[PDB]
RNA sequence: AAUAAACA
């Protein structure tokens, strides 16, 4: 058993510390005016001082192509992790497993901090707020819990009679939307736990929900090939649009924080950009996932780039304006990637398999050789 | 809730610098600019307070200058200024006689949301370059939209070449210059079509490229003549080499290239960090171990380029030329050290200007020594409260005893100006506080005069 | 014109000066006073008109000795090249310009070349000295690992055709205000890889002096050794104590007494003082240490946001400033040893540094940005657009032309009884200000500013209204005294027209624009 | 030093008035919360506070001699029904479990108490 | 006390 009561030896820990990078940028940005003023991080291991976080190099977003492996983070009960979030302080990392546990993993140095028995069902959804206040979760059972920053259990309520698969949140603490496997998107009142409205007319089980950061748009994705992507209108309840995008089973749908770009993972080996103000045409598609693309996460301080999971555990990195992918791990993260979550500083990325593990991914260090088993197996 | 902003000190510190015909065609005049302020300095040589930069006109803008180029238009008696302001505003201005102000010639607002392709957060600054023959001028709006201003009213209507809809899929521009020679405004454009980071060079070895697009002004097409495609991954600014040699030098961080259309590539390496990072054929520059990442440069009439490095070290690169006007080898010399610059200008031949934010941006003077090594001397220095990182209010220590019982606080500020080799404290004190050495009490008198008697 | 006329014109120039309280002259030309030629403009707000060989026109006020009636250049045997003037009370004063400044810059300045990056400065009030953190560049040689037992340091073994990385070694100087040389035997040099993140002047409570507070110089500093080594830090509280000087070196009476220097549990990023408590920022925590005889005893902390890089505070209200996330206001009670979160910003904001806009009863939170902005937040619990006291709200928006790191308050020179000018020095060499006003005097000028924005030929065709917009709603409430300064530049015929077009006379506006110039004539 | 020149000790700001009588703090939703990040209500120490259970700020009780070990990392499920203290005084910590039971400790910077 | 030590 594991209860913190038996003694273990003293150990130094694998540290990915952003503090020597963030301090460096503060010293920089005084005498830096742009990125065209920045001193170059020459490729050698001696230039470990000159790293700035990705806010320092807004230009050149290939900074945050996090292919350097850090740490497999596995539990002692070996359940496959589904959702992964960082605390918006960048302090820890709550992670959802099939037995309904929230293992809070550390941030600068990763250890473990506590276990929870949160859900009676496999966890399926996890989002924080725009302030750090409230965390939203959801599961296979239909129960949605509110969580604080100290992970207090708040009043829980059966939001759905069948398995929720997402929950995203309005630009406030007032409104959010959960889609489930009954096929509906139900938009919720935050405080009253009151069922505002049901967005029917969808056809089959909808497994993702997004909310547009300003305009109040609920975007969804579907297994139903007839009604795959629906925009919605949260105050009225009417179907605003319908976008026929994918041949089967749209997995995860994410909008930028700039408010224009729709991004859509799907089981036909594709990620697609849609400008949401022009649904007639189509922006670029993203080809390179040799099996199905099951997880997608936009980069926080770089609009333009995102990481894109695979059902073969393939972990790929893209960029808007760039047709083929940038980073690459194949046969490397083993299993089926369910979710990704960047650190708030966009410098270290997480993962999560259908195998029982959940690896962590920092940026490539200067002047190392990528002979690692993820990058070049030689 | 309400406030008034008032600006107590105009911003000292020059981000842009040129040498144009601002007041008339007879004399050139050093037009330098900073954040939201333009300055035009003349040149004294017989000054009492010897050479000295004399200010001639200074101008305040309601907007930060993001680039600045100049071109003498058709039949004009002065040299216009192509300013560039944030979110893609061009503004062609001129000095006017009569009213001693400016005079706007043209206003070009390019802040259209379809010119961004959705990218809200503008990261690229709009960059203004001119064709040295004065045929056209090109602004790189938002990184992806070459706005061309044709020249001959003295103007023609502009147009927006899409960058990403060219050949070669340019997609990450680093620098762009108008090259010399030619019959049409050829514009070299460095880019990175498959972008990498110094720190990730084992799967992405060297991805920088060049397209010398040739602008047809009338027909409004653009042939992408001449492309190279495996330049080192970390190339900083490109630079157009003038007419009698032609071509381009392309500063990389750890190397330095000389590229041309009919000549094979020739480029040397400046340290042994080019070993596992570059597949481009690099020789070994003997007796030199430096880097070129933030290094401003200008050209001596032909075959001599003044590189001021990071660290403020001036190198005068000599391009050694064959009899067929081709570059054979390079030749460095460690010339003197000077200001941590942000710009560079050749003035009247034998004078250089080092425009700098962080440091007193000063006027130099190179001479020939008794191949052709140049020795530098500082003639004048424009005073420059630099990037004030922190600043604290202090009390001065020589307040005279007559002013002592004054009710207001009497204080100054000490300012952490500059950076690095030009770092400083600056003692800023707005009013003037005299030293009373002798006082008198003479009532009844109301005026006073002083004369001189032997 | 052919008949023989002057081939010159005259251009009027902007000012800051008003002449508002035999033939007496107010314009007295002086040649060769401290090397300078020019004009002393007498009167109720006396000014100097200095033009050197630079050719630029310099307007330096002289607000000491009150108004000045007359003036004369004076050159004597015992007096150097100086001047000579009447007080208003009939006091003849032989006087000399102080000889250390240079009056050729827009403000009088003396440049003190340190030849190393000055990060901070802190005027220690007791014993009257400055304490500067510096940094020089040493070529690096070791790469710290952390392999499981202790730090191991890999020596950089490369080719002879190799340039080295830069290691910066930090030292805290001690600059003396009397003559501006540094003080020998007073230079706290730090460890090998330790970087100063803050120096301030911190007042901690004590039972020695007749007051409570003492006025130390506290500096926070942490070790940068790359992202693989855990960055740890160390609070360096100092003290400048006058000892007897060495015979021959009278500057050396000043010397540090390091009270506290102990390694903390994480990087020290920001420092503040609150009623004699030391408020320090370690990691994602902000600590509240109290200074005992030799040890710091912890009293309060809160698990804050990512990287708190600026904190200033007054009257137990701590205003933090993260790099990405949010500013926070905090609050420390004494009777319960607790620091707590009162209101934070909820939106992401890439702060540079923060301040305190002070009104007669309102406290505004002036917060500069990455995007060259200023903005004033307030804590308004009765407002319904925030949550109930759990979200700050911006109440003014402005777009400075330049980045801003420095911030300070002053009393300005009944109205203006309790309002503070919260000045700043921008990161491009300029020094601004934000003078608060009332609702009536603002809107008599916003009618003017909108009349000044449209009906004037601005330089380079620029729009001053859209330039001073927020650059993300832009809830602007801050005027532009560099556009309103053009009203002082218009002719008095043109002045009266824009007064009638907004519904007033020029004399009401000239009583409004010259009273925002009079109360802001410090330094 | 900011307190010689621009002193504000004589000002009663609206900010200090906003935090004494708390100026309209809403009775917090979801009565199984924690009241975390909140300081104290002076309405409870002097007299009756007014609202019970669903109140914003913290209500303290006596006879708490040991500070809470979970609370330091930022995980307090109990809140004000906690049987342990929530200050930062480094004298009321528990005995370290591995120094009291299992001989010596392991780490070098153990905060917890080591008694013999 | 509710996982402080969750180790390779
Ligand atoms: Zn209460
Ligand atoms: Zn507790
Ligand atoms: Zn112990």
Instruction: Give the DSSP per-residue string, C368-429.
Output: EETTS-EEEEE--TT-SSS-TTSS-EEEEEE--SS-B---EEEE---TTSS-EEEEEEBTTS
Smallest Cβ distance to C230: which of A17, A27, A44? A17
Q: Counting ligands in written order, which one lies closest to the CA of residue D51?
A: 1
Rounded to an integer, what distance in angstroms lies between the CA atom of residue A176 and that of residue A190? 7
- A328 CA to chain B: closest CA distance, Å? 10
Experimental method: cryo-EM
Nearest to A136 by CA among A174, A165, A176: A176
**CA-CA-CA-CA dihedral for C116, C117, C123, C127, to nearest 10:** -20
Quote the domain boundaries for residue B348. Answer: 3-381
Residue C181: is it exposed, middle or buried by C-beta count within 10 angstroms (0-12/13-18/19+)?
exposed
Contacts of C3 (CB under 8 A, 6+ apart): none
Is A251 in contact with A205 (CB distance < 8 Å)?
no
3-state secondary structure of B417: coil
Nearest to C237 by CA among C286, C200, C187: C200
**CA-CA-CA-CA dihedral for A125, A129, A134, A135, to nearest 10:** 20
Rounded to an integer, what distance in angstroms lies between the CA atom of residue B238 and that of residue B327? 17
Domain membership of residue B355 (yes or no) is: yes
Strand order in the sheet with B136-141: B127-130, B136-141, B145-150, B159-162
Is B194 in contact with B201 (CB distance < 8 Å)?
no
Residue B166: is it exposed, middle or buried by C-beta count within 10 angstroms (0-12/13-18/19+)?
middle
Longest dimension (CA), chain A: 64
Place of tokens 């920022």: C281
Structure tokens at A43: 């490729």
Contacts of B353 (CB under 8 A, 6+ apart): B17, B19, B30, B32, B343, B344, B345, B347, B361, B362, B363, B364
Place of tokens 């070196």: C249
- A6 CA to chain D: closest CA distance, Å? 8
Q: Counting ligands in written order, which one lies closest to the CA of residue D94?
A: 3
DSSP string computed for A87-122: -TTSSEE-EEETTS-B-BEESSB----B-----SS-
3-state secondary structure of C358: strand
Cα angle C241, C244, C248; round to 5: 125
Place of tokens 């220690």: C124
What is the end-to-end Cα distance of chain C in Å, rounded? 49
The phi, psi pair for B413, rounded to 5°, reads: -120, 145
DSSP string computed for B310-360: TTSEEEEEEEEE-TTS-EEEEE--EEEE----S--EE-STT-EE---SSS-
Residues 78-137 of A with CB under 7 A from strand E: 103, 111-115
Domain membership of residue B249 (yes or no) is: yes
Q: How many residues are present in chain C?
A: 523
**CA-CA-CA-CA dihedral for C494, C497, C499, C504, to nearest 10:** 140
DSSP string computed for A218-255: EEEEES-SSS-EEEE-TTT--EEEEE---SS-EEEEEE
Rounded to an integer, what distance in angstroms lies between the CA atom of residue A144 and that of residue A154? 10
Longest dimension (CA), chain C: 96
Residue C159: is it exposed, middle or buried by C-beta count within 10 angstroms (0-12/13-18/19+)?
exposed
Q: Where is chain D broken, named by the residue before each break, C–N > 2.5 Å?
A: none
**Is the CB of A132 less than 8 angstroms away from the CB of C305?**
yes
Residue A117: is it exposed, middle or buried by C-beta count within 10 angstroms (0-12/13-18/19+)?
exposed
Contacts of B194 (CB under 8 A, 6+ apart): A322, A324, A326, B204, B207
Could you check: is the Cβ of residue D114 within 7 Å of any atom of nucleic acid strand E? Answer: no
The phi, psi pair for C501, rounded to 5°, reads: -70, -15
Longest dimension (CA), chain D: 58
Interface test with A, best of D28, D30, D71 (most A CBs within 10 A): D30
Structure tokens at A71: 């740490």
**Is the CB of C121 less than 8 angstroms away from the CB of B420?**
no
The phi, psi pair for A252, rounded to 5°, reads: -135, 140
A178: which strand partners?
A: A186
Q: Counting ligands in written order, which one lies closest to the CA of residue D108?
A: 3
Is B269 in contact with B289 (CB distance < 8 Å)?
no
Interface test with C, best of D9, D12, D13, D41 (most C CBs within 10 A): D13
Domain membership of residue B430 (yes or no) is: no
Place of tokens 């970087």: C195
Could you check: is the Cβ of residue A4 within 7 Å of any atom of nucleic acid strand E? Answer: yes
Rounded to an integer, what distance in angstroms lies between the CA atom of residue C30 and that of residue C39? 6
Is C412 in contact with C434 (CB distance < 8 Å)?
no
Q: Give, in order, the Cα–Cα distances in Å from B71 to each of A159, B75, B102.
A: 68, 12, 16
Residues 2-31 of D with CB under 8 A from B: 4-5
Nearest to B168 by CA among B183, B188, B196, B139: B188
The phi, psi pair for C511, rounded to 5°, reads: -80, -5
C329: which strand partners?
A: C319, C343
Cα angle C333, C334, C338; round to 5: 55
Nearest to C390 by CA among C433, C434, C340, C436: C340
Q: CA nearest C289 in D: which residue?
A: D88
Q: Counting ligands in written order, which one lies closest to the CA of residue D115?
A: 3
Rounded to an integer, what distance in angstroms lies between the CA atom of residue C121 and that of residue B427? 12
Burial A201-240 (b: 16+ CB within 10 A, else e): ebebbbbbbbbbeeeebbbbbbbbeebbbbbbebeeeeee
**CA-CA-CA-CA dihedral for D104, D108, D111, D115, to nearest 10:** 30
In whole angstroms, how large is the CA radius of gyration of chain A? 21
Q: CA nearest A213 in C: which residue?
A: C347
C-chain residues near D110 (CB < 8 A) = none
Q: Where are the beta strands (DSSP E) in B42-88?
A: 55-60, 67-71, 80-85
Domain membership of residue B431 (yes or no) is: no
Query: Using H for helix, E for strand and C for coil, what is the string for C117-180?
Result: CCCEEEEECCCCEEEEEEEEEEECCEEEEECCCCEEEEECCCCCCCCCCEEEEEEECCECCCCC
3-state secondary structure of A62: helix
Q: How many residues are present in chain B?
A: 454
Ligand 1 mean position, distance from CA C356 (Å): 30
Q: Is B72 left (phi over 0), alpha (psi -120 to 50) or beta?
A: beta
Is C194 in contact with C167 (CB distance < 8 Å)?
no
Could you check: is the Cβ of residue D86 within 7 Å of any atom of nucleic acid strand E? Answer: no
Burial A16-54 (b: 16+ CB within 10 A, else e): bbbbbbbbbbbbebbbbbeebbbbbbbbbbbbbbbbbbb
Q: Kindly give the interhelix angle for C492-502 and C506-513, rounded to the nearest 10 degrees.
A: 100
Rounded to an integer, what distance in angstroms lies between the CA atom of residue A308 and that of residue C184? 59
Q: Pairing between strand B80-85 and B89-93?
A: antiparallel
- D34 CA to chain A: closest CA distance, Å? 7
Rounded to an integer, what distance in angstroms lies between the CA atom of residue A318 and that of residue A328? 10
Q: CA nearest B123 in A: which residue?
A: A59
In chain B, how many domains are there?
1
Structure tokens at B422: 């030009």
Q: Give, in order, the Cα–Cα distances in Å from C294 to each of A6, C207, C259.
A: 37, 14, 7
Rounded to an integer, what distance in angstroms lies between the CA atom of residue C520 and that of residue C147? 59
Q: CA nearest C128 in D: which residue?
A: D1
3-state secondary structure of C182: strand
* Resolution expressed in Å: 3.6
Domain membership of residue B448 (yes or no) is: no
Contacts 24+ apart (CB under 8 A), C332-336: C332/C274, C332/C275, C332/C277, C332/C279, C332/C288, C332/C300, C333/D39, C333/D40, C334/C275, C336/D39, C336/D40, C336/D60
What is the spatial distance, in angstroms and rounded to an integer, between the CA atom of C428 and the C1' atom of E1?
A: 57
Q: Give, in order, the Cα–Cα distances in Å from B416 to each of A213, B15, B121, B373, D6.
A: 41, 19, 31, 36, 22
Q: Give, in order, the Cα–Cα distances in Å from A355 to each of A139, A249, A303, A311.
A: 19, 22, 30, 11
Q: Give, in order, the Cα–Cα distances in Å from B254 to each of A36, A38, A40.
A: 16, 15, 10
**CA-CA-CA-CA dihedral for B115, B118, B119, B122, to nearest 10:** 40
3-state secondary structure of A85: coil
Domain membership of residue B407 (yes or no) is: no
Q: Kindly give the interhelix angle for C439-454 and C506-513, rounded to the nearest 10 degrees.
A: 110
Contacts of C50 (CB under 8 A, 6+ apart): C36, C38, C57, C58, C60, C103, C104
Rounded to an integer, what distance in angstroms lies between the CA atom of residue D58 and that of residue C334? 15
Q: What is the DSSP letter of D96?
A: P
Q: What is the DSSP letter of A23?
A: H
Is D25 in contact with D49 (CB distance < 8 Å)?
no
Q: Give, in order, the Cα–Cα distances in Å from B264 to each of B23, B190, B228, B328, C429.
A: 44, 18, 10, 11, 46
CA B451 to chain CA centroid, nearest Å: 51
Place of tokens 């490229």: B209
3-state secondary structure of A336: coil
Structure tokens at A137: 């979760």
CATH number for the domain that contains residue B215: 2.130.10.10
- Within 13 A of A337's CA, how many CA atoms are on the CB side? 34
Other Cβ atoms within 10 Å of D20 Cβ, number: 9
DSSP string computed for B275-312: SSS--S-EEE-TT-----SS-EEEE-SSS-EEEE-TTS
- Interface partners of chain B (CB pairs < 8 Å, 3 or more) are A, C, D
Could you check: is the Cβ of residue D44 within 7 Å of any atom of nucleic acid strand E? Answer: no
Rounded to an integer, what distance in angstroms lies between the CA atom of residue C226 and that of residue C224? 6
Nearest to C353 by CA among C427, C459, C462: C427
Contacts of A338 (CB under 8 A, 6+ apart): A80, A81, A82, A83, A84, A294, A295, A309, A352, A353, A354
Residue B331: is it exposed, middle or buried by C-beta count within 10 angstroms (0-12/13-18/19+)?
middle
Smallest Cβ distance to C95: which of B11, B59, B436? B436
Q: Give, in order, the Cα–Cα distances in Å from B289 to each of B201, B319, B330.
A: 21, 18, 14
The phi, psi pair for C443, rounded to 5°, reads: -75, -15
Asked if D53 has any chain A CB less than 8 Å from its own CB, the reply is no
Nearest to B212 by CA among B255, B253, B241, B232: B241
Rounded to an integer, what distance in angstroms lies between the CA atom of residue A22 and that of residue B38? 34
Nearest to C151 by CA among C195, C190, C197, C191: C191
3-state secondary structure of A29: helix
Rounded to an integer, what distance in angstroms lies between the CA atom of residue A110 and that of residue D94? 25
Is B160 in contact with B141 (CB distance < 8 Å)?
yes
Rounded to an integer, what distance in angstroms lies between the CA atom of residue A26 and that of residue C284? 17
Rounded to an integer, what distance in angstroms lies between the CA atom of residue C392 and that of residue C344? 6
Rounded to an integer, what distance in angstroms lies between the CA atom of residue B244 and that of residue B267? 19
Nearest to A150 by CA among D38, C318, D54, D109: D38
Rounded to an integer, what distance in angstroms lies between the CA atom of residue C492 and that of residue C488? 9
Q: What is the DSSP letter of C266?
A: S
- B414 CA to chain D: closest CA distance, Å? 13
Rounded to an integer, what distance in angstroms lies between the CA atom of residue C456 and that of residue C448? 12
What is the spatial distance, in angstroms and rounded to an integer, between the CA atom of D71 and the C1' atom of E1?
A: 12
Contacts of A298 (CB under 8 A, 6+ apart): A254, A256, A257, A263, A305, A306
Rounded to an integer, what distance in angstroms lies between the CA atom of residue A116 and that of residue A94? 10
- C146 CA to chain A: closest CA distance, Å? 7
Rounded to an integer, what distance in angstroms lies between the CA atom of residue C500 and that of residue C508? 12
Place of tokens 């540090």: C256
- Within 13 A of C449's CA, how many CA atoms are on the CB side? 24
Cα angle B58, B62, B64; round to 5: 85
Structure tokens at B59: 């101008």
Residues 87-106 of D with CB under 7 A from strand E: 94-98, 102, 105-106
3-state secondary structure of C496: helix
Q: What is the DSSP letter of D86?
A: -
The phi, psi pair for C498, rounded to 5°, reads: -70, -20
Q: Is the dihedral of CA C160, C162, C165, C170 positive or negative?
A: positive
Q: Give, in order, the Cα–Cα distances in Å from B330 to each of B237, B270, B319, C251, C482.
A: 18, 11, 5, 52, 51
Cα angle C325, C389, A136; round to 5: 55
């Amino acid at each position: 058993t594991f209860d913190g009561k038996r003694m273990r030896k003293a150990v130094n820990r694998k540290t990915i510390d952003y503090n020597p990078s963030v301090i460096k940028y503060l010293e920089n940005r005084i005498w830096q005016r742009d990125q065209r003023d920045m001193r170059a991080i020459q490729p050698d291991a001696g230039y470990y001082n000159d790293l700035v976080p990705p806010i320092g190099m807004l230009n050149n977003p290939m900074n945050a192509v996090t292919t350097k492996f850090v740490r497999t983070s596995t539990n002692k009960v070996k359940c496959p992790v589904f959702v992964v979030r960082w605390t918006p302080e960048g302090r820890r990392l709550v992670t959802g497993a099939s037995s309904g546990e929230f293992t809070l993993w550390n941030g600068l140095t990763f250890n473990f901090e506590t276990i929870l028995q949160a859900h009676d069902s496999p966890v399926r959804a996890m989002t924080w707020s725009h302030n750090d206040m409230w965390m939203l979760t959801a599961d296979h059972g239909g129960y949605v819990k509110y969580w604080q920053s100290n992970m207090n259990n708040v009043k829980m309520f059966q939001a759905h009679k069948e398995a929720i698969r997402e929950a995203s949140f309005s630009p406030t603490d007032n409104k959010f939307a959960t889609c489930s496997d009954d096929g509906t998107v139900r938009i919720w009142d935050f405080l009253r736990c009151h069922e505002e409205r049901i967005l029917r007319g969808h056809g089959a089980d909808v497994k993702c929900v997004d909310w547009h950061p300003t305009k109040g748009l609920v975007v969804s994705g579907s297994k139903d090939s007839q009604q795959p992507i629906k925009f919605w209108d949260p105050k009225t309840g009417q179907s605003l649009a319908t976008l026929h995008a994918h041949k089967n089973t749209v997995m995860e749908v994410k909008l930028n924080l700039n408010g224009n770009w729709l991004l859509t993972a799907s089981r036909d080996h594709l990620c697609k950009l849609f400008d949401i103000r022009n649904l007639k045409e189509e922006l670029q598609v993203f080809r390179g996932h040799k099996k199905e693309a099951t997880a997608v996460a936009w980069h926080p301080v770089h609009e333009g780039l995102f990481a894109s999971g695979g059902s073969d555990g393939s972990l790929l990195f893209w960029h808007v304006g760039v047709e083929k992918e940038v980073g690459g791990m194949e046969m490397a993260h083993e299993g089926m990637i369910w979710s990704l979550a960047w650190h708030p500083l966009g410098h270290i990325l997480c993962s999560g398999s259908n195998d029982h593990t959940s690896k962590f991914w920092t940026r490539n260090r200067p002047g190392d050789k990528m002979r690692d088993r993820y990058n070049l197996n030689l | 809730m309400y406030a008034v902003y008032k600006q107590a000190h105009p911003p000292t510190g020059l981000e842009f610098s040129m040498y144009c015909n601002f007041f008339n065609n007879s004399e050139r005049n050093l037009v330098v600019a900073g954040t939201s302020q333009l300055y035009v300095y003349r040149l004294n040589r017989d000054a009492e307070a010897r050479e000295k930069l004399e200010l001639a006109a200074s101008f305040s803008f309601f907007g930060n200058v993001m680039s600045m180029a100049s071109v003498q238009l058709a039949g004009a008696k002065r040299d216009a200024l192509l300013l560039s302001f944030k979110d893609a505003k061009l503004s062609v201005v001129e000095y006017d006689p009569g009213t001693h102000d400016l005079k706007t010639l043209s206003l070009h607002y390019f802040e259209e949301p379809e010119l961004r392709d959705g990218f809200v957060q503008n990261v690229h600054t709009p960059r203004v370059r001119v064709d040295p023959d004065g045929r056209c001028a090109a602004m790189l709006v938002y990184g992806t939209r070459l706005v061309v201003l044709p020249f001959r009213s003295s103007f023609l209507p502009s147009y927006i070449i899409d960058v990403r809809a060219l050949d070669e899929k340019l997609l990450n521009i680093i620098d762009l210059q108008f090259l010399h020679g030619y019959y049409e405004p050829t514009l070299l454009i460095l880019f990175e079509p498959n972008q990498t980071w110094p720190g990730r060079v084992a799967v992405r070895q060297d991805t920088c490229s060049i397209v010398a697009i040739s602008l047809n002004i009338t027909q409004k097409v653009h042939p992408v003549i001449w492309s190279l495609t495996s330049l080192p991954f970390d190339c900083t600014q490109a630079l157009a080499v003038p007419k009698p040699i032609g071509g381009v030098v392309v500063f990389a961080v750890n190397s330095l290239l000389y590229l041309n259309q009919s000549v094979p590539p020739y480029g040397v390496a400046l340290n042994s960090l080019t070993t596992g990072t570059t597949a481009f054929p690099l020789r070994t520059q003997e007796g030199v171990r430096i880097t070129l990442d933030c290094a401003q440069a200008t050209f001596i009439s032909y075959d001599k380029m003044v590189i001021s490095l990071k660290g403020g070290e001036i190198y005068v690169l000599t391009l050694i030329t064959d009899g067929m006007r081709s570059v054979r080898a390079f030749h460095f010399d460690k010339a003197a050290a000077s200001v941590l610059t942000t710009s560079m200008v050749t003035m009247e031949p034998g004078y250089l200007f080092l425009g700098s934010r962080l440091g007193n941006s000063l006027l130099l003077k190179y001479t020939e020594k008794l191949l052709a090594t140049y020795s530098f001397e500082v003639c004048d220095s424009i005073l420059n409260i630099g990037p004030c990182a922190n600043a604290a209010v202090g009390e001065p220590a020589f307040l005279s005893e007559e002013f002592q019982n004054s009710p207001e606080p009497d204080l100054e500020i000490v300012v952490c100006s500059g950076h690095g080799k030009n770092g400083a404290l600056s003692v800023l004190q707005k009013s003037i506080r005299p030293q009373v050495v002798t006082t008198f009490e003479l009532p009844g008198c109301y005026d006073m005069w002083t004369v001189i008697a032997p | 014109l052919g008949q023989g006329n002057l081939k010159v014109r005259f251009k009027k120039v902007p000012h800051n000066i008003n002449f508002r309280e035999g033939r007496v002259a107010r314009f007295r030309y002086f040649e060769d006073i401290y090397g300078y030629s020019g004009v002393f403009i007498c009167g109720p707000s006396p000014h100097w008109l200095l033009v050197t060989g630079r050719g630029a026109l310099r307007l330096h006020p002289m607000a000491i000795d009150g108004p000045v009636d007359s003036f004369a250049p004076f050159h004597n045997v015992n007096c150097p090249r100086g001047f000579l003037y009447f007080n208003r009370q009939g006091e003849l004063r032989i006087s000399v310009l102080p000889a250390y400044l240079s009056y050729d810059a827009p403000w009088p300045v003396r440049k003190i070349p340190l030849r190393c990056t000055a990060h901070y400065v802190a005027y220690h009030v007791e014993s009257k000295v400055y304490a500067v953190a510096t940094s020089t560049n040493t070529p690096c040689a070791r790469i710290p690992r952390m392999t499981g037992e202790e730090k191991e340091f890999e020596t950089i073994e490369r080719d002879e055709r190799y340039i080295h990385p830069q290691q910066e070694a930090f030292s805290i100087q001690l600059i003396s205000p009397v003559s501006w040389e540094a003080i020998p035997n007073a230079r706290i040099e730090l460890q090998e890889w330790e970087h100063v993140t803050c120096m301030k002047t911190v007042s901690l409570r004590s039972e020695e002096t007749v007051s409570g507070l003492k006025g130390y110089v506290a500096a926070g500093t942490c070790l940068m050794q790359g992202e693989e080594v855990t960055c740890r830090g160390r609070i360096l509280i100092m003290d400048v104590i006058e000892v007897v000087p060495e015979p021959g070196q009278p500057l050396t009476k000043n010397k540090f007494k390091v009270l506290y220097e102990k390694e903390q549990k994480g990087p020290v990023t920001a420092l503040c003082h609150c009623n004699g408590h030391l408020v320090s920022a370690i990691g994602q925590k902000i600590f509240l240490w109290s200074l005992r005889a030799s040890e710091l005893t912890g009293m309060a902390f809160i698990d804050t946001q990512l990287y708190i890089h600026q904190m200033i505070s007054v009257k137990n209200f701590i205003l933090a400033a993260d790099v990405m996330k949010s500013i926070s206001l905090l609050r420390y009670q004494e009777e319960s040893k607790t620091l707590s979160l009162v209101s934070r910003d909820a939106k992401p904001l890439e702060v540079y540094s923060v301040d305190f806009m002070v009104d007669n009863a309102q406290l505004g939170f002036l917060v500069s940005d990455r995007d060259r902005n200023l903005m004033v937040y307030m804590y308004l619990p009765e407002a319904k657009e925030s949550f109930g006291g759990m979200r700050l709200l911006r109440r003014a928006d402005f777009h400075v032309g330049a980045h801003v790191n420095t911030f300070w308050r002053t009393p300005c020179r009944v109205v203006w009884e309790n309002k503070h000018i919260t000045w700043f020095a921008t990161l491009d060499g300029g020094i601004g200000l934000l003078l608060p006003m009332q609702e009536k005097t603002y809107r008599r000028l916003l009618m003017l500013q909108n009349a000044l924005t449209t009906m004037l030929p601005h330089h380079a065709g620029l729009n001053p209204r859209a330039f001073r917009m927020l650059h993300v709603n832009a809830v602007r409430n801050v005027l532009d005294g560099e556009l309103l300064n053009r009203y002082l530049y218009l002719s008095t015929m043109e002045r009266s027209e824009l007064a009638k077009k907004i519904g007033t006379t020029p004399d009401i506006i000239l009583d409004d624009l010259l009273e925002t110039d009079r109360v802001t004539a410090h330094f | 030093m900011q307190e010689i020149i621009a002193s504000v000790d004589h000002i009663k700001f609206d900010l200090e008035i906003a935090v004494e009588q708390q100026l309209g703090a809403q009775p917090l939703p979801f009565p199984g919360m924690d009241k975390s990040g909140a300081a104290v209500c002076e309405f409870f120490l002097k007299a009756a506070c007014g609202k019970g259970g669903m109140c914003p700020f913290r209500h303290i009780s006596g006879e708490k001699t040991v500070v809470c070990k979970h609370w330091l990392r930022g995980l307090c499920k109990k809140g004000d029904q906690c049987e342990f203290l929530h200050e930062y005084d480094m004298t009321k910590m528990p005995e370290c479990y591995f120094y009291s039971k299992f001989g010596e400790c392991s780490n070098k910077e153990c905060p917890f108490l080591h008694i013999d």
